[PDB]
Amino acid sequence: MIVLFVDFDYFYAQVEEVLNPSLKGKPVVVCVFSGRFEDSGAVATANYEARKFGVKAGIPIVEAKKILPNAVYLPMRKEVYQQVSSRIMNLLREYSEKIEIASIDEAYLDISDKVRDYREAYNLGLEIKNKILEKEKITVTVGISKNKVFAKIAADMAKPNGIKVIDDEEVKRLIRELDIADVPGIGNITAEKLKKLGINKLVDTLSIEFDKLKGMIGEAKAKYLISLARDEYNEAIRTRVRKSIGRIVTMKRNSRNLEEIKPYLFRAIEESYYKLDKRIPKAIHVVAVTEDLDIVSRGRTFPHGISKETAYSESVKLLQKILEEDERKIRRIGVRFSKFIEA
DNA sequence: GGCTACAGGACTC
DNA sequence: AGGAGTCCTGTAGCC
Numbered sequence: 001m002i003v004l005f006v007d008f009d010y011f012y013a014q015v016e017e018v019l020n021p022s023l024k025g026k027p028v029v030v031c032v033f034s035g036r037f038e039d040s041g042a043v044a045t046a047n048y049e050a051r052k053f054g055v056k057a058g059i060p061i062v063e064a065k066k067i068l069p070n071a072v073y074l075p076m077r078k079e080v081y082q083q084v085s086s087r088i089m090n091l092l093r094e095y096s097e098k099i100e101i102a103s104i105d106e107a108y109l110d111i112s113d114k115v116r117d118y119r120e121a122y123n124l125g126l127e128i129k130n131k132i133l134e135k136e137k138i139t140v141t142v143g144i145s146k147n148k149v150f151a152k153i154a155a156d157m158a159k160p161n162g163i164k165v166i167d168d169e170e171v172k173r174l175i176r177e178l179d180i181a182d183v184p185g186i187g188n189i190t191a192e193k194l195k196k197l198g199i200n201k202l203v204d205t206l207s208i209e210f211d212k213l214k215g216m217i218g219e220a221k222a223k224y225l226i227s228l229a230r231d232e233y234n235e236a237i238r239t240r241v242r243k244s245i246g247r248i249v250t251m252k253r254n255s256r257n258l259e260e261i262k263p264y265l266f267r268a269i270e271e272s273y274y275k276l277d278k279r280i281p282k283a284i285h286v287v288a289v290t291e292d293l294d295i296v297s298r299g300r301t302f303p304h305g306i307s308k309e310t311a312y313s314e315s316v317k318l319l320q321k322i323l324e325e326d327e328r329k330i331r332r333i334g335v336r337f338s339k340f341i342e343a
Numbered sequence: 344g345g346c347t348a349c350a351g352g353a354c355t356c
Numbered sequence: 357a358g359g360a361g362t363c364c365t366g367t368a369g370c371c
């Protein structure tokens with residue numbers, strides 16, 4: 001198989017530049033303001049000019065401002081970024097029937113039937129980049145390889161505004177040489193667990209006892225890494241269908257008082273139901289983030305769809321369970337709906 | 344022994 | 357010390 005992966009560069013920040021070209025060449029930081037106090041919140045992303053100085057996704061906005069007090073700080077406008085995303089995805093559909101939209105800024109295309117070899121794949125990648133630049137003035141990075149995982153790795157290597165093929169010989173090189181932390185699905189927690197076992201490369205997973213590997217990282221992750229290391233990985237490129245919709249908000253102060261929390265919970269429900277738009281969930285989960293940043297939840301599945309009135313009443317019962325079973329104060333409160341009726 | 348539903352761990356964006 | 361969404365797993369009831 002020949003897989004072509006597209007990952008949009010500096011996406012939210014790049015969109016803001018397209019809509020305001022005066023931002024060109026300035027550091028730009030897209031922010032998620034929690035509303036708790038002045039500049040409370042985190043960075044969603046930043047462009048190269050800010051990121052090169054350490055302003056990276058997830059850091060507190062106050063910390064970004066200590067590093068770059070004169071950068072341009074913009075509130076996240078996700079609805080804008082989504083609309084631009086959708087248009088770019090529509091452009092990509094023209095290059096393959098076999099296409100997976102993986103996230104707000106990623107797609108995988110199976111181009112096995114559109115091209116013969118990696119040379120033709122590379123050239124199609126150039127054509128795609130040109131098209132997206134022509135139509136939307138957005139730069140992207142293309143990764144091309146034999147499966148989804150190595151196509152994503154290919155793009156990681158070529159970012160930003162790049163294009164890279166990882167041929168069959170380089171897959172073997174990477175199995176030996178790629179830091180296993182840089183494999184998709186391996187975060188800091190798993191990477192450290194693997195270091196405890198002595199595993200630094202994919203190849204290392206082949207010689208460790210399977211039960212040892214599994215005991216530390218679980219069966220699925222073990223089999224995943226081994227299949228990659230064996231160069232025997234397969235994962236379908238296919239239509240992702242949204243399985244859950246939800247909203248969680250930060251409260252102005254921490255609280256374990258039901259009547260103080262209800263209004264935030266009810267706003268989260270209202271916004272969630274708006275986003276559901278015709279989709280009818282059969283399951284509801286209430287999610288709380290405690291003052292110490294632990295996430296706790298309580299959910300329920302019904303044998304029918306959940307009306308908004310039922311969501312209100314059941315959400316309170318689930319929050320009640322959290323308050324009954326946990327003595328801590330709550331900082332963020334929200335809901336997630338799932339198990340949609342197939343309409 | 345392996346379904347199911349639920350609560351939490353961990354990852355991606 | 358944001359916020360959205362997904363997949364896996366330990367546990368316990370049930371067959």
Ligand SMILES: Nc1ccn([C@H]2C[C@H](O)[C@@H](COP(=O)(O)OP(=O)(O)O)O2)c(=O)n1
Pocket residue numbers: 007008009010011012013043044045046057058104105356
């Ligand atoms: N922790 C994160 C990571 C990404 N995002 C959003 C903002 C990013 O522009 C897009 C795409 O993620 P990606 O990790 O590829 O980041 P960039 O494209 O480099 O900005 O998703 C976010 O809101 N929070």
Ligand SMILES: [Ca+2]
Pocket residue numbers: 007106
């Ligand atoms: Ca990506």
Ligand SMILES: [Ca+2]
Pocket residue numbers: 007008009010011105
């Ligand atoms: Ca990106």
Ligand SMILES: [Ca+2]
Pocket residue numbers: 181182183186187188
């Ligand atoms: Ca990693």
Ligand SMILES: [Ca+2]
Pocket residue numbers: 344345
């Ligand atoms: Ca059995």
